[PDB]
């Protein structure tokens, strides 16, 4: 039975993300729901934490007006991370795909969009779930 | 006293206006937090002073980005008759930069009262950027 | 009056540097600007004569950077100091968690740093030091004297 | 099958390079994927033994690049090296085009016809990143190599 060990809430402009660390008898993993839904192993969650730091850095150094991308393939899942910008402002979009195993053949590629203002809070929340629970 | 330009910045559920203006003696910025505070929550900076302020924000941004999960930082700025107190704090609702501006009453006596804005830390990069643009525009070379 | 003689853009990671050669009645000189977030407080000034000595210092930082090997307040790896023509140039190779960089701070030189310094600072990501030295060397071959 | 032990991304100009340490039933090895600005991906595969030699060779390219001085006008590779270890060859050429110098590494089969585009198993490191790349490689070798 998958039982959540912790929830986390991050408010950014008028959007909300929940970071739930869950564990079924397979192991421990992270879920990230918007106001779609990513699922990450803790090991992959570490890579995100660090990549978020890369993104934060780049955003702080932009100054006034993709800007930056990362490409991650881990355990049958592929993650695209694009720091972009548009009329209303800068954001980080994260798309999760199945590129192998059960679930291939799609209708369900997952996506979340974080406003850039909240990357630091979102990274800080992730970091502490890693901190507490480890890999 | 000309209006030269405005820029608006929404941070979380709070709104700020950076307004450039000129009068003889020079150009200057007015930064207001929208609320019930009126002029109590509105700063006034010369252009010279805006630059030093922009740079201080650079430093607050760096401190905030490396806090990790958790006054955290204080800086200080005085020019002509005006003092600017900058304090990166955290209360239960999150991290913020409090800028309190004072007008010196005379040789070695602080104001009984000042004006103050509070920026949620998640908005500092936006704020800094809006301010940087207006500085690049409205008085160099 | 100031003639604009030449201009060179050097892109290094997510930074852009401009090297402008100018000339006034006193002689030829460089202005070196870093673009972005910071202001025109990221503006170095150097006669051609001093730009030569700066090029040579950059060769030593390049050697040191190449010999660091993999990494591990901020750690000061190599510091050098150039004072010339009533200006002081501090050159510190440093590293943080996010990479290695050469920070150059220019001040106006009176006594043992007495008055207003006029702290102009640029920060070259270390990756770019050879590109930067090279652009500078070209401008010196083209516009310097002997 | 293959387990993923460690990753490191090096940003050089508008490209990215992923150095991945992996292990299969036979061996531990390194995959190096270049991602171009436009989406182009290409890669090398190195045994950990070979990465040591590649890292050493990078040191030679670094020394050469640092000593070049700026591109002079025309009047071809500025420097070539060659690496052969059993079933894989690697052609290392330091070149320049209008946008800079770069180290092309081109991996081929040693015995076998070959398969796939030559570009898909070639990478081009902008020379500016040789030091950071060699350093990131040196670290992965330190922390997951036995050699």
Author numbering:
A (entry chain C): 57 to 91, 98 to 127, 142 to 211
B (entry chain D): 58 to 127, 142 to 212
C (entry chain A): 57 to 128, 139 to 212
D (entry chain B): 57 to 131, 141 to 212
The authors write:
Mutations in the human PURA gene cause the neurodevelopmental PURA syndrome. Whereas PUR repeat I and II assemble into an N-terminal PUR domain via intramolecular interactions, two C-terminal PUR repeats III from different molecules interact with each other and thus mediate dimerization of PURA. All these PUR domains belong to the class of the PC4-like protein family, which mainly bind single-stranded nucleic acids and can unwind double-stranded DNA and RNA.
CD spectra had already suggested that this mutation has no dramatic effect on the overall domain folding. To assess if this variant has a rather local effect on the structural integrity of PURA that may not be detectable by CD spectroscopy, we solved the crystal structure of hsPURA I–II R140P at 2.15 Å resolution. The crystals of R140P variant protein exhibited the same space group, unit cell parameters, and crystal packing as the wild-type protein. The R140P variant is located at the end of the flexible linker between PUR repeats I and II connecting helix α1 to the strand β5. Because of its position in a flexible region, the mutated residue is partially visible only in one out of four PURA chains in the asymmetric unit. The overlap of the R140P-variant structure with the PURA I–II WT fragment confirmed our previous observation about the unusually high flexibility of the strands β4 and β8 forming the β-ridge. Since no major structural differences were visible between hsPURA I–II WT and R140P variant (average r.m.s.d. of 0.89 Å for 133 Cα atoms aligned), we concluded that this genetic variation is unlikely to impair the structural integrity of hsPURA. In contrast, hsPURA I–II R140P did not show impaired RNA binding. In contrast, hsPURA I–II R140P variant showed wild-type-like separation of dsDNA, further supporting our previous interpretation from RNA-binding analyses that the genetic variant R140P is likely functional.
